[PDB]
């Protein structure tokens, strides 16, 4: 199976005067590349995929693909939907624009059954010839890809090679790798990056890496080299920032942090996302002071 | 004051035939709803597979609803929500143009807006049209919750926002809402607890069961609004089994299964990622249906 693993970043999407700030987007991708990141995830959850037009969706993927040419860095494009016809289109669309693989979130809101989830991903996987990584985040979608469904899709679809897990369920992560040890379990939850990696996970798709790519990159590769004492020691230092980056709904805290670090010009979201509370703004600022934030 | 749309309302299923919207079955079903005491129809809501319908099919179903309900008392409360505020504003203006009397606007799903964001989201929607706007809170589907304070603030600050459809299994919250803002129109979005919500001051239901048994849901709602709580509770108790079995799998998979079993739609067709039920739930739905008299056309 072709895979995309290692330290990966769910890229924020910076806005300037309500439009996508395309040059800062490219500049941020160069900061990830230069700090040990192995792949970037454009237009994911952290990238406010829900409020981007199809043209901006395309724009961010092509900026990501263009910026990563000549590097080892891959583009794992966000291309998921709660309508299978749309998800197939976004999958074919991300492939036609040079993405190395697609991250495909479980259908949100309309909550399909396991049989429906199977047919959903089977249709997506059969529409492209690039790796497909499942994305399970039940707190956001209202549904759960069961361990059995993930394993069947991994075994039945050639390009489906693993799953982003954002479920705070280390039991499920043991379930997955004990029954199907060939899948690429990817952590979608920064605080438990090390426990997932130490059980056989092969990478992270990180929110914290937007701000601290070098630390998330070092953590993952220490762990992949089975240097678990150095991986756990980075995981332990990151716990405070990992948690505070979710004091409000992601990506509200991480964009707040990027703005506080001077990495983006405007603290702009698209509604229904908005600036954090004045408290949470202050709490994020306080926790940031205990970390060294790389510049450009 | 405030313009309101209340009473017995149906979240219409959207029948498909050969992958297309059966517009001709759609009109027949709406005319079956009218003819059985329903006060309003909800096109392209959650039960209508709004997520897998194109914007053109969105228009088509709203239009059929507006046209089929012309000359009757039945209103059209169109589904017009999105997790992107710019899109929700567009769908709200869009629904007004096709004759909808009001809009049901689901809370932003997936992206979990904060309470502040939810307020600005709905304030933008309400200011874009001059027709009633009903909030829709279903946290099990959206991953977020419109708090009581946010609902009340929205009701008081925007003239088109007049209530909320509650699908949260939280009768405490419904007491919280009507005790602090008793002028609001609390609408039940949970068929099994239709009567408890109505007996606490709720002013209507937006029902899934009403697709199959519109006469029973209509009588239940009207009994309760006329304060005949013994007859309203008696229909609610009779409906409990079908109310639950219609959620043995994710709505609208069971209700469409029942509508097909009742011969009310031609094809048991969904749009992926929705699919036909398991073989066992097909049998369970069929068995529970047996105890109810299902009105025809
Ligand atoms: Mg180069
Ligand atoms: Mg090494
Ligand atoms: Mg320091």
From Swiss-Prot, chain B:
- Record's GO cellular component terms: cytosol
Catalysed reaction per UniProt? Answer: L-aspartate 4-semialdehyde + pyruvate = (2S,4S)-4-hydroxy-2,3,4,5-tetrahydrodipicolinate + H2O + H(+)
Q: In which pathway does it act?
A: Amino-acid biosynthesis; L-lysine biosynthesis via DAP pathway; (S)-tetrahydrodipicolinate from L-aspartate: step 3/4
**SUPFAM superfamilies (alphabetical):** Aldolase
The organism's superkingdom is given as: Bacteria
GO MF entries: 4-hydroxy-tetrahydrodipicolinate synthase activity
Q: EC number(s)?
A: 4.3.3.7
Binding-site residues for pyruvate, renumbered to this chain: 47, 206
- What biological processes does GO assign it? diaminopimelate biosynthetic process; lysine biosynthetic process via diaminopimelate
**Keyword vocabulary terms for this entry:** Amino-acid biosynthesis, Cytoplasm, Diaminopimelate biosynthesis, Lyase, Lysine biosynthesis, Schiff base
Q: Is DNA damage one of the keywords?
A: no
The active site of this protein is located at: 136 (proton donor/acceptor), 165 (schiff-base intermediate with substrate)
- Identify its protein family: Belongs to the DapA family.
Give the NCBIfam families listed for this entry: dapA
Q: Can you state the subunit structure given in the record? A: Homotetramer; dimer of dimers.
Please give the name of this protein: 4-hydroxy-tetrahydrodipicolinate synthase
Q: Which organism is it from?
A: Campylobacter jejuni subsp. jejuni serotype O:2 (strain ATCC 700819 / NCTC 11168)
